[PDB]
């Protein structure tokens, strides 16, 4: 009762409009019959719940609303690179939320929530790899592939966590061999090789501290590298 | 012995060098007894382990300097911003460190590496407020303080991790009402004052889903409406 909506009400029920619309432009798109009738169980499930004013079930949806969004545009990107291991990762995503949803395994949802990032950006690797022609970097997103299908089957937080930083340091990096591609400059194809040394070695000795700093260094050398292009 | 120094050696090390160029010259800028020490000790355990072959420290000495890299950009930034509480957590990041590593703790350097990002954050958000003289955004900012002081004191990774997701957040909010106010977009402050509500509710109920959920709006956000100018 009190003043009736309030404006974090608002604000959320604001949001996950915003969120639907994108999902239902990606599942027209799509036409993919699971997303299709996730659309229909979303939208009925916000109706009841802003009909009922329940705002932590409001909250859970714009959250979970937010990652069939991502679902989409990973179903969307892994579409058009066709591979059908990712393929087949992304629709694991979407039966494993399905099935976290449906017993409130609120635990599951957030390791699926950076699984999903991590597909995306794998699929993301992928078509930057392609268009480098670089199979170095092949090696390394065939990898991150078997880690992400390991981490979907028997990951933990931390385990999915971790995999996800080295999956954002090999995107950044990739993102940097391309810019040493556009810009001819050779002193930064020397910066992106000693990066992707030390990206090999994350891969081989997943220390966390050296993790978290070698994710510094690449995103602050990417960032550097785009601003002094 | 095998076949000398390994190419991951000498990437490491490229790395600490490159470290040690931009840590000298802050610890020459800043006159700080202090740092001017650790630059001698860090100066010296190097040495001693690029003398020694001894992979695992290099790679330790790589991160550490790293963190007093961070460490020196946030006393120039705290200095300039002349706040006495940030001053504090600038000075506690650096004692806790040289304790972490006296004792080896590894768990601690963690740890304050997102206390040392968080502190960096907070000072460039006080920076934006100012900038803004918004006094709601300083409200948000002196609450921050306040969850640093405690977490510097007694947070856990978990806590930490949380707290270093809504500094980011707030930072980034702070950074979308700037581009309100140099492109005179009514419809983007509208926007902005939905994120804030959003940003606001995470600070009251810190559920790791909403916040997770709500970093990746307000970043996408940020990315839009800086592309969307």
Same mark, same amino acid.
């Given at each position: ?70 679902? +989409? %545009?990973? *179903? !969307?990107? &892994?579409?058009? /690179?066709?591979? #059908?291991? =990712? $393929?087949?990762?992304? @629709? ?81 990096? +990739? %993102?940097? *061999? !391309?810019? &040493?591609?556009? /810009?001819?400059? #050779?002193? =930064? $194809?020397?910066?992106? @090789? ?36």
């Amino acid at each position: 009762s009190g003043s009736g909506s309030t404006e974090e009400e608002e604000a959320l029920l604001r949001w996950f409009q915003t969120l639907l619309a994108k999902f239902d432009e990606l599942v027209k798109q799509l036409g993919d019959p699971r997303l299709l009738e996730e659309a229909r169980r979303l939208q009925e499930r916000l109706e009841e719940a802003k009909k009922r004013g329940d705002k932590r079930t409001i909250k859970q949806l714009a959250a979970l609303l937010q990652m069939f969004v991502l679902i +989409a %545009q990973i *179903f !969307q990107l &892994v579409e058009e /690179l066709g591979d #059908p291991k =990712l $393929l087949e990762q992304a @629709k694991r995503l979407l039966e494993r939320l399905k099935e976290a949803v449906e017993r409130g395994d609120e635990e599951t949802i957030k390791e699926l929530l950076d699984l999903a990032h991590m597909t995306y950006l794998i699929a993301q690797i992928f078509q930057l790899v392609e268009q480098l022609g670089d199979p170095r970097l092949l090696e390394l997103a065939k990898e991150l592939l078997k880690r992400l299908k390991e981490a979907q089957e028997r990951g933990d937080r931390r385990t999915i966590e971790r995999l996800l930083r080295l999956v954002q340091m090999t995107y950044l990096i +990739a %993102q940097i *061999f !391309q810019l &040493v591609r556009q /810009l001819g400059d #050779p002193r =930064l $194809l020397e910066t992106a @090789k000693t990066l992707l040394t030390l990206l090999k070695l994350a891969f081989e000795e997943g220390d966390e501290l050296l993790i978290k700093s070698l994710l510094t260094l690449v995103a602050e050398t990417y960032r550097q590298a785009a601003a002094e292009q």
